Symmetry: C3
Subunit: 212 residues, 3 copies
Amino acid sequence: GPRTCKDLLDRGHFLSGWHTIYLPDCRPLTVLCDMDTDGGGWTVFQRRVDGSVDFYRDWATYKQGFGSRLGEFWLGNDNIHALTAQGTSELRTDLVDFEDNYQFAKYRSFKVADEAEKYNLVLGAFVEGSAGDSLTFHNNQSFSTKDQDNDLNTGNCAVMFQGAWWYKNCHTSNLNGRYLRGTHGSFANGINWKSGKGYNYSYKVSEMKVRP
Amino acid sequence: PCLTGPRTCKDLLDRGHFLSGWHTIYLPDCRPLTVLCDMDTDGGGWTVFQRRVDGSVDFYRDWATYKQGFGSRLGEFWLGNDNIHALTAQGTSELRTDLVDFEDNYQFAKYRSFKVADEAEKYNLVLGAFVEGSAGDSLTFHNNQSFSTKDQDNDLNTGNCAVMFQGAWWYKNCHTSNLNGRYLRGTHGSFANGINWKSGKGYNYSYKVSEMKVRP
Amino acid sequence: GPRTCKDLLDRGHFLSGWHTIYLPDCRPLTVLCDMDTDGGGWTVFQRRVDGSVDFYRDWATYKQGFGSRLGEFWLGNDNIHALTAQGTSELRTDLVDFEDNYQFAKYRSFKVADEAEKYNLVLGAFVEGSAGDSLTFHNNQSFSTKDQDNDLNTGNCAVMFQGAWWYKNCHTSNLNGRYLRGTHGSFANGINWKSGKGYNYSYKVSEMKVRP
Ligand SMILES: *[C@@H]1O[C@H](CO[C@@H]2O[C@@H](C)[C@@H](O)[C@@H](O)[C@@H]2O)[C@@H](O[C@@H]2O[C@H](CO)[C@@H](O[C@H]3O[C@H](CO)[C@@H](O)[C@H](O)[C@@H]3O)[C@H](O)[C@H]2NC(C)=O)[C@H](O)[C@H]1NC(C)=O
Ligand SMILES: *[C@@H]1O[C@H](CO)[C@@H](O)[C@H](O)[C@H]1NC(C)=O
Ligand SMILES: C[N+](C)(C)CCOP(=O)(O)O
Ligand SMILES: [Ca+2]
Ligand SMILES: [Ca+2]
Ligand SMILES: [Ca+2]
Ligand SMILES: [Ca+2]
């Protein structure tokens, strides 16, 4: 049984799409495989495309995943942990702006600790990216939702920034923020990536994906 | 195979399928049917039987086409009146209607029960009370009406509602909702012939997104 | 087991979508069925819809197929060969312009040969269609890509018209050309069908599909 989207590609599945893979415990998970980008074989765990799905959600909803296979989704923190748990996988963030310019950022390794240990981002070196590095900042940080104050801020970033992320004090990227659609008067609260288009530009497309 | 598998989108949710998407369920006669589950809205577990999203599919269709279903799992579809009957025949599924306008305003309507009868009763709508909903109630008017299409007029109008309003629905004389009407993209001059919900955006506004869905 | 999209239709699958069929040799293949158009039961091997996928690809990429089940794709020349080898598939070509006007072309028989014959086009008579006939000109020609020029031009048709096709000298259709979005000054390098909207109009939607 295929472990990853990479295995599916090696088995001759050349079209991107939803396929079932088997996580280490042999639980089946239907995941979105990107078989085109950068050699293919990526498992996509976040996708924003059109603002049809609310990403301003609570801890339990980020834990189990939400959205739709027909568009936007977060795969879920438990699933992302299970996917990235033993061994390691490249993280790749793909971004597409309103003018259709591609930026990306690729980290050597990526995982998140299980719910007992919050979803602490354990993340390797930045390898390369036109987006620049905007995650290492958040390394060794719990994930935080509006109703879960694991952030070290005097107040609540998730509420301040209308999303969820490994918030510290507070964020340099915010890809699960509001779908504001370009540049946006308010501060730090869209699909932002600081080193990319900054704290006042919300991307059109966001995808976070993993590969062995 | 049938006896092990899910019988509704609600069972799939309870088994840990948290993403909306197409999954195969087993009807009461054990027929497998691939249906769209909404796991994301109002607690999830809804089986979606109508979906409009971009006007790519013609909804101005005949009786036999509505009977069997048409459209695409990629986008827009009507699941089919025989399937909707089989999904709702045995007890109590509630109905949710989700509508999005071109300005990203989300409105909905929720009904306590919804059942459509078989082909022999012309898919008669059996509709429970309006629970709540920011779209207002534009379906109680249509309670106990036959389903009608352009080529089969079962309405209470002396004419042809399906033709007049370029749709297929449980028309009375004629309508207050028309979610299988034409994809007119927002404001239209033509009367009552779009994806309309009277109490919502009125007879001259065709929604961007329409979804009709059911749950136990 | 279903052998074609037509068998699926006859078994009561009335919604278009991706289903797995069994090729002549019993290899499973997940294919897009069009269950609506012209009686339904078509297996779609090419789809353009929005320009999200690059069709300017090499020989090996066209051989194995590329793109996405959520959108645009080429099914792959080996698969198209395997689908069309055993007998008589009709071909239907569906085109939509930017004013949502539909045109089509239908051919009696269509097959492509194997890799050794360079996926040669074997095309039966034109039956009808509002787009007119812009494929018979290409009868009995090898498929060409940028990196494998099997065309009748002193140069490279695939490069000159940014596509992949059964080019002669050079073309009257170019449905794997660039997604130029309606009328374009540039000559013959879009999703073009000469008898349809001409050498300077690139369709919004193109689909190529087959049925027994
Ligand atoms: C559904 O509507 C029925 C009438 O509509 C028709 O039947 C549909 C299923 C559909 O085929 C439609 O297009 C048809 O036109 C209602 O039936 C009527 O119900 C009436 C009572 O509400 C009944 O009346 C009577 O009232 C008293 C009873 O003591 C008598 O004095 C009188 O003689 C009548 O008997 C009427 O006769 C009946 N009509 C018909 C043609 O059957 C039906 O009740 C309604 N159902 C619900 C749940 O509202
Ligand atoms: C096709 O072209 C070949 C050479 O490429 C030639 O031998 C042949 O006669 C043609 N065949 C048919 C059936 O038209
Ligand atoms: C992936 N690529 C850069 C190495 C080879 C080219 O493939 P294609 O993109 O030309 O079809
Ligand atoms: Ca705090
Ligand atoms: Ca009438
Ligand atoms: Ca070469
Ligand atoms: Ca040449």
